[PDB]
Design a protein around this motif. Structure first.
Motif: not given
Ligand SMILES: CCCCCCCCCCCCCCCC(=O)O
Ligand SMILES: [Cl-]
Ligand SMILES: [Mg+2]
Ligand SMILES: [Mg+2]
Length: 132
Positions: A25, A31, A35, A40, A58, A105, A116, A127
Motif C-alpha cells: 500500500l 509506520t 502497525g 486493534p 496508534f 478487505i 479479515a 488477520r
Molecule cells: C488498523 C490500525 C493499525 C495499523 C496502522 C498501520 C497503517 C496501515 C493500515 C493498513 C490498512 C488496515 C487494514 C486493516 C484490516 C483489518 O481490519 O484487520
C-alpha cells in the motif's frame, strides 16, 4: 443483509503477512513498525448505516456505509479512497480505490471468529479476531 453475528466488539488475535501488505500500500517503514505492533479492536454496529470502527493506540478509524453504495473513506494510513462494501456468501467485502489502485478487505465469520483477508497486488494478509 449482513448477519447479526458480525455485530459486536472484536479483538485482533493473529496477523500474518501484514508487513508486506502495508508495503504494497505504500506505507513507510516507521509506520509499518507501529502497525505491526498494534493489536486493534474492531467494533461493528448498525443503526441504519453499518459502522466499522477500528481503535488502536496508534490510529483510530471509522467508516459508516450502506451496502453497495460508494462512499469516501480515509484509511488508517491516510489514503483518501472511494470505497464500496458488498455482501457475497455471507462475507463482507470492502474494496478501496485511489490513484488508479485497488485493495480488498474481505471479512467473514469462521467458527465464531472474524477473519479479515486483505489483498493488494497479489499480496495476501490474514488477520483473525475473537469476539469480546
Ligand atoms: C488498523 C490500525 C493499525 C495499523 C496502522 C498501520 C497503517 C496501515 C493500515 C493498513 C490498512 C488496515 C487494514 C486493516 C484490516 C483489518 O481490519 O484487520
Ligand atoms: Cl494497539
Ligand atoms: Mg503474526
Ligand atoms: Mg508481517
Amino acid at each position: 443483509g449482513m448477519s447479526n453475528k458480525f455485530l459486536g466488539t472484536w479483538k485482533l488475535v493473529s496477523s500474518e503477512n501484514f508487513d508486506d501488505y502495508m508495503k504494497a500500500l505504500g506505507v513507510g517503514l516507521a509506520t509499518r513498525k507501529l502497525g505491526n505492533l498494534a493489536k486493534p479492536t474492531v467494533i461493528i454496529s448498525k443503526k441504519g448505516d453499518i459502522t466499522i470502527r477500528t481503535e488502536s493506540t496508534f490510529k483510530n478509524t471509522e467508516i459508516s456505509f450502506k451496502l453497495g453504495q460508494e462512499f469516501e473513506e480515509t484509511t488508517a494510513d491516510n489514503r483518501k479512497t472511494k470505497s464500496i462494501v458488498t455482501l457475497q456468501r455471507g462475507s463482507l467485502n470492502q474494496v478501496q480505490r485511489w490513484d488508479g489502485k485497488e485493495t480488498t478487505i474481505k471479512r467473514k465469520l469462521v467458527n465464531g471468529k472474524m477473519v479479515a483477508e486483505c489483498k493488494m497486488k497479489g499480496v495476501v494478509c490474514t488477520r483473525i479476531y475473537e469476539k469480546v
